[PDB]
Amino acid sequence: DNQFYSVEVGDSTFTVLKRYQNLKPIGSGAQGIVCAAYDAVLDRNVAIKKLSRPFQNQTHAKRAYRELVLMKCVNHKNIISLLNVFTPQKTLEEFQDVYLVMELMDANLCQVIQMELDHERMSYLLYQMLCGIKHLHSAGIIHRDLKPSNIVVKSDCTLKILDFGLASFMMTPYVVTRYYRAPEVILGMGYKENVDIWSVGCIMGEMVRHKILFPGRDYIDQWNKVIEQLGTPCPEFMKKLQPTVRNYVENRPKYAGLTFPKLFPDSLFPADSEHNKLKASQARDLLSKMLVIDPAKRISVDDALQHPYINVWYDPAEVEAPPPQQLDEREHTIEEWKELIYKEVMN
Ligand SMILES: O=C1c2ccccc2-c2n[nH]c3cccc1c23
């Protein structure tokens, strides 16, 4: 009595439990391919993500295992919830693919970016974003890899962050995105919680300009786009850079960097009225507090959530609450990773 059936979607095959019906493509990325589907058991729509051979490389396998262990433990209204996990393969020897069933959303942030939002929507999206980051932080997790493709939303303006971020060489088709990586994390500097504020900043700025703030072919080219617009960091900051780095950085063409009002003119914001003009200045202020090269001066999540522009949706229940009560860290080989993932999936 088999409980699986296969269907073609995109240029790949999905083999799932019969409960999942009428699958339909909805995008793809690095971690894998995703589908939309109706779940007859729960009588609702779900998102089904297929991880093909997650154990193929160390990093890829650590990501899968981690996301899998944390997706069952944490449970915040802004973190994507895992509904079910399964593999069609029935023995460790044959074990190949893993399927994650999650709540279905209507679009990722890349799409939202392509459009304009009113101050009310934009601030709400940002509120939920920072709120999710605060929950992760209080659980000892610091993302460090927040980007628009990792965030999804629904029509009712609800938002959820997908993966849990970062914890070897790679040549796979997976892009080398790093446009959203904080400066300190780039120049090998150490980092802290507020390292995520920089990403939110890049994302917020991108939702306003509708363009990647810092387009960089390579981590070297990116640093330029950063300095050009934001200007060169203060000497003190440099004193904090490693010799090998402070050298390259301090010998890099200096820059004044365009002011914030210029970087985010009133034309990118609704200037309908005084209320909107006032809201546009408060957004600009928030951006100038998050897009700070030197983290020492960059605002924190708790402060960002109190910012006038965001404060509007504050709620002491969704912010200050008791976070969740197996955390690996040892490197393993492909084979060990495959059994670890398999045992996890099989429980
Ligand atoms: O990539 C998407 C995605 C992309 C566009 C629209 C909805 C979703 C969506 N809804 N739930 C999940 C769970 C994981 C990934 C994704 C989703």
Swiss-Prot record:
Residues of the full protein shown: 45 to 400 of 464
Active site: D145
Residue positions where Phosphothreonine is found in the record: T172
Lineage, opening ranks: Eukaryota, Metazoa, Chordata, Craniata, Vertebrata
Domain writeup: The TXY motif contains the threonine and tyrosine residues whose phosphorylation activates the MAP kinases.
Catalytic activity entry: L-seryl-[protein] + ATP = O-phospho-L-seryl-[protein] + ADP + H(+); L-threonyl-[protein] + ATP = O-phospho-L-threonyl-[protein] + ADP + H(+)
Annotated keywords: ATP-binding, Biological rhythms, Chromosomal rearrangement, Cytoplasm, Epilepsy, Intellectual disability, Kinase, Lipoprotein, Membrane, Mitochondrion, Nucleotide-binding, Nucleus, Palmitate, Phosphoprotein, Serine/threonine-protein kinase, Transferase
Described purpose of this protein according to its UniProt entry: Serine/threonine-protein kinase involved in various processes such as neuronal proliferation, differentiation, migration and programmed cell death. Extracellular stimuli such as pro-inflammatory cytokines or physical stress stimulate the stress-activated protein kinase/c-Jun N-terminal kinase (SAP/JNK) signaling pathway. In this cascade, two dual specificity kinases MAP2K4/MKK4 and MAP2K7/MKK7 phosphorylate and activate MAPK10/JNK3.
GO biological process: cellular senescence; Fc-epsilon receptor signaling pathway; JNK cascade; protein phosphorylation; regulation of circadian rhythm; response to light stimulus; rhythmic process; signal transduction
Short motif (TXY): ranges: 172-174
Taxonomic superkingdom: Eukaryota
Quaternary structure and interacting proteins, as annotated: Interacts with MAPKBP1. Interacts with MAPK8IP1/JIP-1 and MAPK8IP3/JIP-3/JSAP1. Interacts with SPAG9/MAPK8IP4/JIP4. Interacts with HDAC9. Interacts with ARRB2; the interaction enhances MAPK10 activation by MAP3K5. Interacts with SARM1. Interacts with JUND; interaction is inhibited in the presence of MEN1.
Protein name: Mitogen-activated protein kinase 10
Cofactor(s) of this protein: Mg(2+)
Its membrane topology: Lipid-anchor
Assigned protein family: Belongs to the protein kinase superfamily. CMGC Ser/Thr protein kinase family. MAP kinase subfamily.
Disease linked to the protein: A chromosomal aberration involving MAPK10 has been found in a single patient with pharmacoresistant epileptic encephalopathy. Translocation t(Y;4)(q11.2;q21) which causes MAPK10 truncation.
Gene Ontology molecular function, alphabetical: ATP binding; JUN kinase activity; MAP kinase kinase activity; protein serine kinase activity
